[PDB]
Amino acid sequence: EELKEGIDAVYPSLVGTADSKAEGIKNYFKLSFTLPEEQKSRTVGSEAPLKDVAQALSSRARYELFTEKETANPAFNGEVIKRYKELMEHGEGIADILRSRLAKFLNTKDVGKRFAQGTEANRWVGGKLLNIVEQDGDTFKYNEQLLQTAVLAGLQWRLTATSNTAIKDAKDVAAITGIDQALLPEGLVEQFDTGMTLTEAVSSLAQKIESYWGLSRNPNAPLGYTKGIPTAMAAEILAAFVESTDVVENIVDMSEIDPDNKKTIGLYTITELDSFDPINSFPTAIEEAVLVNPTEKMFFGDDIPPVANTQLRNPAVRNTPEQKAALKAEQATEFYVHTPMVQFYETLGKDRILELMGAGTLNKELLNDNHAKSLEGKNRSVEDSYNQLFSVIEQVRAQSEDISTVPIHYAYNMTRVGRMQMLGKYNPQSAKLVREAILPTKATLDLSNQNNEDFSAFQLGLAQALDIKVHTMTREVMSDELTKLLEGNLKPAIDMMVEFNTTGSLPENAVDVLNTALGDRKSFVALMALMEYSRYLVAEDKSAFVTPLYVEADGVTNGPINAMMLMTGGLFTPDWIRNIAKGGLFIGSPNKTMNEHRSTADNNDLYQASTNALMESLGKLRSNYASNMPIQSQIDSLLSLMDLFLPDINLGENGALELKRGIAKNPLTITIYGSGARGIAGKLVSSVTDAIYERMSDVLKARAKDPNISAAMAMFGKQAASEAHAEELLARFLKDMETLTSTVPVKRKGVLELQSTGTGAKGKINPKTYTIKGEQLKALQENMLHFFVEPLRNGITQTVGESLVYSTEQLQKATQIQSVVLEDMFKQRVQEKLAEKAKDPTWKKGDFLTQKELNDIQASLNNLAPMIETGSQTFYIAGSENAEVANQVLATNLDDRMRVPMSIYAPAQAGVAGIPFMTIGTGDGMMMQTLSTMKGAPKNTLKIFDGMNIGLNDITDASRKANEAVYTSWQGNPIKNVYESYAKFMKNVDFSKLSPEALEAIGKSALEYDQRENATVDDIANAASLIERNLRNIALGVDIRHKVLDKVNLSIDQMAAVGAPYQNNGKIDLSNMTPEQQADELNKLFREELEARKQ
DNA sequence: CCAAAAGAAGCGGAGCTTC
């Protein structure tokens, strides 16, 4: 413990004494940090970090010497050096702003004078930066080493933070704003996704600052300072960036949206550099100079990423040896630029790519306001992908003369749901634009004979890219569908691309050519197909055609099928056998493929099946209210409105209802995963209203083209046969909107009753400003809920099985109950430590606990089995980071604003998270992990969770391996894993110790509704043990089912497209049998196995 | 439903208050 002397030698003039027990001013920087055993940052010890790093950046030679390396990134050239010189000068500006901000803080309310007189201002929420100041005559000044290093971190954050932010969707924006997800105004999601919240901005900035300071946290120092000091620095730097206009602050007033929402929420947006800024070609020079082991960098050639030790954002969970092996395998894969696609993108240019793939140039007077905001968001995503691709390309271009031969590696980590996530927002796994320019897939094909297997592979890739659903038809049938398309509608586009691949030029009408040819087949991968086919046509040597074109093996209705296989717990039923076949589990059909199943046996997948069951439930609901004309009319109007605007709903002339799989796809999925019906109703309404607002733009565009067009032809001209037709479609719309907003169904004692809202929609429609307001949205949702979603939910249960639903319920309940106890006990042990600390004269409220103290509290939870283990994966369902544990501000800026809450890694309630955690984890997660690590693991692939892109040379074997990996995952038993954790929990939990809040939360899960009011401790303890019994029985059933299934002849084609099924070679032959016969035989084998347990 | 949380700001020196 010579760590006190060490850090004092480096920072001898900081104000105060590095002694927690001292009477006067105590220095909490020196008390909180220590010098590392091995250098982490090259700025430690530097008198002037900004000067030193600026010199290092001033030339290649100086950079190489400072970094103690032989050769710098070749992207670090003259133009880039000049830009960094200018950026360093800007660093001086930020430093100067910070110094003045400190001066102002010291002067205001005499804080500096009081601090000098012994007022412990350095322990205030806004004064923690006084721990990094030094006496300066009658005042104080920043330690220059710490300030300048922090500014360097600030500059790196400014350059690359935006590219590393998370994506905000509707759920995220609802949590942030506190506005019900279904009622979010159009473009609010887009507004919030483009900016950072205060916590988002400060936490990322603070991480950078602490990293560059290059020290280690003292485990016996309070988090109020270890986390507090760098956060305080970050808050000041964010404030400085607002002053400099590097960051724009927008305080968004929620009361303008919902008058009873008091929240005012800060959004921070970094000012974007020019797309042509040379700094874009190497944006991490600072990072790679300051840090001995940089995080932010590209991995070129044989520079490979390290393997992460812990689960993403879950430091309590180590990646298992098998997970680390999978990560290593994926990080080993080489990606390469496909020059033709880069040149194609480049030649079209950003504007034309936006026109083709986004919304083009928006003119805000032919657009409905709400629709205009969605179109803005669509442009943003495409533009950001384009810009990010070309920044990467500029860096790749510097590495070699031939960009197509520069290997690129990507870092991955395991998420909390066991998926291998490629890090970054704009990479091949996450961004479709990028996916068609940077690829690991490569093959040299013999395309000289259209009868070759190589040519068949080529065709499969092209067809899939062109939106032919290749898994639904045999290879032979696919081939003919592709040929017709290539020689038909696509031919003018192919001709254009042939010319491009000859002269390098595109015509002025290139966008129109592609649009007209592709129609609804338009996608980035479709562009790759047109490119590659045209390249083949002009190829000199068709016998050795080199292409990155791929085939994606993708899981057919993957999550739902995995749940059905992994968690169905009773005896076998013929309906389950038929339905699981829809997912590619074929019993008694050696070598059967999904392609054959779809073409000869059953053309309806699981989602289509549930749609059919919805149609039955709907009929039953109508019969229950046959004599009720108001109810019948209300149902009619809902279905009418959906028919008007949604592609997956169709009503025939005589009233015949037709539904496509698309309406059930997400609802079925998220229902299994614990979604309420209300949320689904909200999403369906949003899809309807999206289409309405778009149709309103179609109106404004029709009126501009023709001022004497009728409202009926302006809104329904493109949709109608004649004009009288457009008139009856318009009448429908107005009638539907009136009744669906003025009247709502309410359930009263199991009966639906119509009620007047009093807030019905009436008035002339102004297509420009037209917006369906909150109360009217609520009414649409209520109609959608009771007349569509409830029937759909009934259909869902019928399709996936009541047995599965039961398993998922018990899983949810157990994991929720456990998480409630974990959360409450953590909080109680925290409050108990804080009551002790309140006796410590060295401790002040706002100082929190130490890391050791928190580590001890987490370790004390271990007899409650917080972790779920499978043998190859670890899940921590309760793991979170939240502000509710410390319930206090961590730091503010020096203006008493930017008040960052103190967030702590702690267990929190799971809610329904246990279901998707376990289903995604032991399903697609385990499948991919197995694919990366199994004997003969396919090489040169890109994995996208339940889909895998395969090079054309290896489509057969890699597909068969994928199906084998499915079979391997289907040997799992997530319920058994949950049970083993819950069983340990149950023998160590003391329900009497729980707070009243925790006991109430467990009551909801463990008890029937008529039990919460009067709940005793012993009642809910008894109820919790009952769930343990339920889990044990389900787990036993699953085990038997898997064992029995393994004995039988199986052909598995869940990872479909190629027609390469995995055969388990089970010896019991169930061929030439109905599902009823099969179920009987399987159940005989079940009982036989069940009687083997007994004895 | 899940894969990441997440109000601001005066006065005063924490945390109540009001918007």
Ligand SMILES: Nc1nc2c(ncn2[C@@H]2O[C@H](COP(=O)(O)CP(=O)(O)OP(=O)(O)O)[C@@H](O)[C@H]2O)c(=O)[nH]1
């Ligand atoms: N918890 C959630 N999981 C989702 C959601 N969307 C997709 N997924 C998961 O990813 C899985 C694969 O998604 P895909 O895009 O391939 C669609 P899916 O496989 O369900 O059916 P196909 O259309 O046959 O591919 C899916 O089955 C779910 O387990 C979602 O909104 N929430």
Ligand SMILES: Nc1nc2c(ncn2[C@@H]2O[C@H](COP(=O)(O)CP(=O)(O)OP(=O)(O)O)[C@@H](O)[C@H]2O)c(=O)[nH]1
């Ligand atoms: N857990 C979740 N996974 C998702 C969700 N959305 C997408 N995904 C996963 O990411 C994969 C890619 O999603 P995309 O947006 O590209 C939809 P697409 O049909 O184009 O994907 P493919 O299945 O690869 O054809 C998807 O298949 C799922 O496996 C989600 O909301 N939750």
Ligand SMILES: O=P([O-])(O)O
């Ligand atoms: O093109 P699909 O059939 O693999 O989705």
Ligand SMILES: [Mn+2]
């Ligand atoms: Mn899928």
Ligand SMILES: [Mn+2]
């Ligand atoms: Mn997929």
